[PDB]
Amino acid sequence: STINNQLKALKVIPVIAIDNAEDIIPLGKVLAENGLPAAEITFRSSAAVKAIMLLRSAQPEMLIGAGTILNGVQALAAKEAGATFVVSPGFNPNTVRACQIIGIDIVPGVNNPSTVEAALEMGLTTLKFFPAEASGGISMVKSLVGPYGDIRLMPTGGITPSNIDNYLAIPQVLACGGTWMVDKKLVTNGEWDEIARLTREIVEQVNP
């Protein structure tokens, strides 16, 4: 549950889709110095792993997770690269075991009551709620946390500065994942000041 404490403090986790792994270095520097020392690096590119390895070297105290983890092989790659937890879009009990066996923390995605119960049955309580807006948004979140007092959620998908407060107002929401402050377009274009501005702005917003 160490992860829970860090998430609860951060309130927002950058979800990063990187093209060139080298780009994680300036990106991580901007995130950390603007008050957001966390990153979930998605396995949407062959490079992400190198990105985790470079980021862990450059920002040793950063909270680094790997996302889009669909199987135990990828979970292992992420663990060996230096991630301390993995996350997946949905819930695959085969992936969850594999993570138990290789020894890394998994926060799997759910979006309905049945999948929550499946996760609870495997001993998991911190779950990603994805895709958050497309699955019904805050109304859905309230419907899940209501019957399931033990769960803690990380809503991701369609989260923006205009709607994040509503999610964070729910006690069982730990933090939300967001791509907007690390959008690939901004990274590709080297818009470092803007990334810095978006990061400072969200940190001030959620942790006033």
């Binding site: 792993v49 190198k50 390895m53 470079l54 070297s57 135990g72 092989v73 292992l76 790659a77 663990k79 060996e80 690269a81 594999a98 066996i101 290789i102 020894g103």
Partner: protein
């Protein structure tokens, strides 16, 4: 029910064994594992053979990392034939996992490459031990 030997070296610059071990335990919950570490790549063949013959391993992973010089190239060639000869004497597979240092462009890549090759080959062992048919299906596969 099944048993695997893993032989690695102190010479290598990346720990390849841990990831291979983790992979196999992940795929088979109950598989037995035995490890021996030797100094160099030329010490691999006999250690591999003893594990097959004296420790009752069904299969072995031989993990090494040849250096960059045209002399480490000769050492690995020597070590590879040894591995093949050890296999032919015992009627048992040794999966050779050699990651030459010339294949990566820096150390970060080499750590990545060695770990990945180890894991993939660990998956190949699983299939050879338990699911040969999948392999048969993937014939001609990229």
């Amino acid at each position: 029910t099944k048993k695997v030997g893993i032989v690695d070296t102190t010479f290598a610059r990346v720990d390849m064994a841990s990831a291979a071990i983790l992979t196999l335990k992940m795929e088979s919950p109950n598989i037995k594992i035995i490890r021996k570490t030797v100094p160099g790549i030329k010490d691999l063949p006999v250690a591999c053979k003893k594990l097959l013959e004296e420790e009752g391993c069904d299969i072995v992973m031989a993990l090494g990392m040849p250096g960059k010089a045209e002399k480490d190239k000769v050492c690995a060639h020597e070590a590879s034939l040894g591995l093949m000869l050890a296999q032919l004497m015992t009627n048992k597979h040794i999966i050779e996992v050699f990651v030459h240092e010339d294949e990566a462009k820096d150390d970060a890549e080499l750590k990545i490459l060695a770990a990945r090759r180890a894991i993939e080959h660990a998956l190949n062992v699983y299939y050879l031990l338990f699911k040969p048919e999948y392999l048969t299906r993937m014939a001609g596969k990229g």
